[model samples]
Target: GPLGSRKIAQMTEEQFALALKMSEQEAREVNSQEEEEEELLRKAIAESLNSCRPSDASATRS
Candidate 1:
């Protein structure tokens, strides 16, 4: 099977080697968490509400 929930650090040589061939992105420290959208909700909320008025943002248009 492919990469499971196990940590990369604990992966076996065979598992890691096979995984490396399939996807180098998993090993190069470029995988998960590094480039994640940290302030996803913060920026998203600001962007979405930037042009929207308080009433419009709070009220649901029926």
Candidate 2:
């Protein structure tokens, strides 16, 4: 996030392409750690017949 290129200056197309590949590899490390919040919420509500909270998701989850 610290980096920025306006494309109006010293940044070249080749540099941008290399940055893209590096950026992609960093994402997998996060997507693997990014647990779906709804899955956690659904798991907590599962054993309760969806009675724990008043939510549209909860209503349909039942």
Candidate 3:
């Protein structure tokens, strides 16, 4: 993907600083969301394995 072609002189310093602050906030939010999704996925997987294992797994060590 290509970014917009803009020269250094095209943007104001205040606008640039605002973008940087926004970027940091988004980064933190994305990471927090990713962590929550991973935790939910792990629990779902455990539940599936428990409910889907062989019906006689308890006595079928084979």
Candidate 4:
């Protein structure tokens, strides 16, 4: 069945609150995992860039 205005209007305030809380917790967990992944990616990119550059290049290229 399609969730029209009738279905939405049937939800109680308590149900709405519970749904909001669950969504917020799930968002936080996802955000935390994303931050960890981003940190790892940043480190990997930095290390790879460092490895590709020559040691003497930094001194000569001013």
TM-score of 3: 0.45
- Per-residue error (Å), model 2, residue 16: 0.3
Candidate 3 positional error at 61, Å = 18
Model 2 regions more than 4 Å off: 1-9, 28-62
CA lDDT of each candidate? Answer: 0.68, 0.71, 0.80, 0.81
Candidate 4 local lDDT, 1-62, one digit each (tens):
56577656577999999988988977855667788899999999999988865578557863
lDDT agreement of model 2 with the native: 0.71
Per-residue CA lDDT of model 1 for 1-62, tens digit only, reads: 48765655676889878887767656564655544566675778789877755577657874
**TM, every model:** 0.29, 0.31, 0.45, 0.44
Listed per candidate, the RMSD to the true structure in angstroms reads 11.2, 12.1, 6.9, 6.8
> In candidate 2, what are the lDDT values of residues 1-62, reduced to their tens digit?
45667644786999999888877977645653356776777788786885666679556774
* Candidate ranking (lDDT, best to worst): 4, 3, 2, 1
Which digits, one per residue and each the tens of the lDDT, describe model 3 over residues 1-62? 27656643677999999988988978744667788899999999999988955667568665
By summed lDDT, which 10 consecutive residues of candidate 4 come out lowest? Answer: 53-62
Candidate that beats the other on TM-score, 2 or 4, i.e. the better one: 4
- Any runs in candidate 3 off by more than 4 Å, and if so which? 1-9, 28-31, 47-62
| Backbone clashes counted, model 1 | 0
Question: Between 1 and 4, whose lDDT is larger?
Answer: 4
Measured on C-alpha atoms, candidate 1 has an lDDT of 0.68
Displacement of residue 38 (Cα, Å) in model 3 is 3.3
Between the candidate structures 1 and 4, which one is better when assessed by TM-score? 4
- Which 10-residue window of candidate 2 scores lowest in summed lDDT? 27-36
